[PDB]
């Protein structure tokens, strides 16, 4: 088909021309942000069309060309496809990133290194798009490590600031543990099914699916900021703000679980696999939910919130419902891109003090961003018919109506209450209280690009959740037959969480000054996991690197065993042989005893 394939390929190919613009530049532009924004707008307006054709007819397809190293029984080309997920995801990402181009025209206007910034961020979009279009698994690996290293650079944008390059080093380290998991899965697929190709792998159903799915779990919990490898996410928040928006709202964080959403016909079986899936999801959900409480920075609250949402998506893969998880990806992406962009607006408006202490009075300080925050932190919980209703509450309904682990259900329930209460506390300390922020104020939103971007994403997070979530072919069986107190329980838990957080707020209105009781510490110090592991394992490995590797094994022992013993043997034998004083009687006595020892002891005439 001409139109469908041609328009998908031009949506891929429009994100190569501004790299040609900077490479063949030679006379430096000024409207290069305008150029990147309008080419992302054109890429979205050509990415709307084949999705419309997809819902209107069906008609999935793959394209595959330019094979290189067709060596053995396998062959690999640039091979990418558009199916349900693979082109229902792309317009959402392009739309979100076009709004971030608006907000990054505004927010990064006063820094003269803007061209290299938009170069890096466009290249990041290119790599994540290559990740979400491909079916050749090696091309998925290309997109994987490419978005890992662009995440490294965009976290370490502000050179100087040892926190930033420490953050970037932690991010690339956990991405290489994602790499060891993913290459273990790739090795099993090569050796047991002759390829890494999703068509043939789904064509079979290999039943001994333990080693590859364990590798997939390791790769997903590395890339998707989950328990065991989670604490790089607030550290990743320590970079620039639209960096953090694009990097942990829509892209680069769903690419852990998007692989598992891709491999649904292989994880149809293996009850052990789904048990690991939803146990890990419930652990992450409760852990970063409890850790999100008593956090006093904005971006770290938003990072723990998005980690809890990815925990619900791992629960959504544990129950056999992948399409609901994909719907949650889309709505979540719109939602937290809008939330990050609103918080970045406030932080640049208030001289970057950035913290929840010394933040208070912002309602009626022009209330466009307060409207954005109340729509957002309303939409994070289950609000009965908004965008956050559909995904999250179908997730908890299908999680409750299944043969589940009976404790993961309780973990997701308690953590839904926890996301209700930190949503309430971020509203209360950000917008409501008495104004605590220093004088000579220049709070400003008389500004075209800011209100256009926030406008576009609130129009997104009000309608596009329903528009996406309704006209899709039903790829599963909806449950739809619940008792009482199993459908009501989402709204019940969010309302009791609001009552709990509002009474905690009214106790904050009091004055008693209670001492902490170390659960405050356990929830306040990011959990003890970052401090304990980041002071043990950099100390243990490098203590065993100085003693064993550096001074002990190579240098001192290997230079004693191979050079020194040989050289000292030659030195001592030389100082025994050549140390002869010149008396002739000794030499002729040596001749005589040589003659006797050759005749009678060790015979030479016999």
């Amino acid at each position: 088909m001409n139109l469908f394939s041609s328009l998908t390929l031009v949506t891929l190919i429009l994100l190569t021309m501004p790299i040609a613009a900077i490479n063949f530049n030679t006379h430096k532009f000024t409207n290069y942000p305008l150029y990147v924004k309008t080419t992302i707008s054109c890429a979205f307006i050509t990415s709307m069309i084949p999705t419309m054709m997809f819902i209107h007819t069906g008609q999935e397809m793959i394209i595959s060309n330019w094979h290189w190293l067709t060596i053995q029984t396998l062959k690999l080309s640039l091979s990418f496809k558009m199916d349900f997920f693979s082109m229902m995801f792309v317009p959402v990402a392009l739309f979100v990133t076009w709004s971030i181009m608006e907000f990054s025209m505004w927010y990064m206007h006063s820094d003269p290194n803007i061209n290299q910034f938009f170069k890096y961020l466009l290249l990041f979009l290119i790599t994540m798009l290559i990740l979400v279009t491909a079916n050749n698994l090696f091309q998925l690996f290309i997109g994987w490590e490419g978005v890992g290293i662009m995440s490294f650079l965009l976290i370490g944008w502000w050179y100087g600031r040892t926190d930033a390059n420490t953050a970037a080093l932690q991010a690339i380290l956990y991405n290489r543990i994602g790499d060891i998991g993913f290459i273990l899965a790739m090795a099993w697929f090569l050796i047991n099914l002759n390829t890494w190709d999703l068509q043939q792998i789904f064509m079979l159903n290999p039943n001994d699916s333990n080693l590859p799915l364990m590798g997939l779990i390791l790769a997903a919990t590395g890339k998707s900021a989950q328990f065991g490898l989670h604490p790089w996410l607030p550290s990743a928040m320590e970079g620039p703000t639209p960096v953090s928006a694009l990097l942990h709202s829509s892209t680069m964080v769903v690419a852990g679980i998007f692989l598992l959403i891709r491999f649904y016909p292989l994880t149809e079986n293996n009850k052990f696999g789904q048990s690991i899936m939803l146990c890990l999801g419930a652990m992450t959900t409760l852990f970063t939910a409890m850790c999100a409480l008593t956090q006093n920075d904005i971006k770290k609250i938003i990072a723990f919130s998005t980690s809890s949402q990815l925990g619900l998506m791992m629960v959504t893969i544990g129950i056999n419902q992948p399409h609901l998880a994909f719907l949650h990806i889309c709505t979540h992406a719109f939602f937290k891109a809008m939330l990050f962009m609103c918080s970045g607006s406030i932080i640049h408006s208030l001289n970057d003090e950035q913290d929840i202490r010394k933040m208070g009075g912002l309602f009626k300080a022009m209330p466009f961003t307060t409207t954005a925050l109340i729509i957002g932190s309303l939409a994070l919980t289950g609000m009965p018919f908004l965008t956050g209703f559909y995904s999250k509450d179908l997730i908890i309904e299908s999680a409750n109506t299944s043969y589940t682990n009976a404790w993961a259900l309780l973990m997701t329930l308690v953590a839904t209450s926890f996301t209700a209460i930190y949503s309430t506390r971020i509203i209360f300390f950000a917008l409501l209280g008495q104004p605590r922020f220093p004088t000579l104020i220049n709070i400003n939103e008389n500004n075209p690009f800011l209100i256009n971007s926030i406008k576009r994403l609130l129009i997104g997070s009000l309608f596009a959740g329903f528009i996406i979530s309704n006209n899709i072919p039903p790829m599963t069986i909806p449950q739809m037959t619940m008792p009482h107190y199993l459908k009501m329980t989402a709204l019940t838990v969010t309302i009791l969480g609001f009552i709990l957080a509002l009474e905690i707020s009214n106790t904050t209105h009091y004055l008693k000054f209670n001492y902490p009781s170390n659960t405050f510490k356990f929830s306040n110090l990011l959990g003890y996991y970052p401090t304990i592991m980041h002071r043990l394992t950099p100390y243990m490995n490098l203590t065993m690197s100085q003693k064993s590797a550096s001074s002990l094994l190579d240098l001192i022992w290997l230079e004693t065993i191979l050079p020194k013993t040989i050289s000292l043997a030659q030195m001592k034998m030389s100082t025994t042989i050549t140390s002869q004083k010149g008396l002739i009687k000794l030499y002729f006595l040596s001749f005589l005893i040589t003659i006797l020892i050759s005749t009678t002891l060790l015979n030479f005439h016999e």
């Binding site: 040892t162 146990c279 419930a282 404790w407 259900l409 304990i532 002990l552």
Partner: protein, 157 residues
């Protein structure tokens, strides 16, 4: 252009001359100079310092090298490659260390214990199997088109 006798062969003995030479050579106080001692792990006679020294050194003193916390004449503790900020932060913790590791390992053990208690005791809604029409949906499983027509039926209840 450098003196050969500003390097460091041999350990501490003897006590007047070598300690006086090392104290004049490392720009250190005489009683602040401490070798490791000579257990034979190498180490020459390089001094022992209080070993942490990098999330200390309060950053308002305004020395020379700002992101290294050195001052051009400090003896530069032996493990400094492991000690820079962006490598290891041995700050005085807000709580403890032993109490922290006890709470963490107890909490992780409790979460995995309750996950095991969950894995032995599942929940389920009161519901039979999913009844498939044509021989437990045969011919759309792995195949065998004429080998095994397996007689199994469902009944209305």
């Amino acid at each position: 252009s450098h003196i050969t006798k500003d390097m460091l062969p041999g350990p501490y003995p003897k006590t007047p001359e070598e300690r006086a030479a090392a104290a004049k050579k490392y720009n250190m106080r005489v009683e602040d100079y401490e070798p490791y001692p000579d257990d034979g792990m190498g180490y020459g006679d390089y001094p022992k310092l209080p070993d942490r020294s990098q999330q200390e050194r309060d950053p308002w003193y305004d020395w020379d090298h700002p992101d290294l916390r050195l001052n051009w004449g400090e003896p530069m503790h032996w493990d400094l490659d492991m000690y820079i900020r962006n490598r290891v932060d041995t700050s005085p913790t807000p709580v403890n260390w032993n109490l922290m590791c006890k709470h963490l390992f107890g909490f992780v053990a409790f979460m995995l214990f309750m996950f095991w208690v969950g894995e032995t005791y599942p929940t389920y809604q009161p519901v039979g199997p999913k009844q498939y029409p044509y021989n437990n949906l045969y011919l759309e499983r792995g195949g065998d088109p004429n080998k095994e027509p397996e007689p199994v039926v469902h009944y209305e209840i």
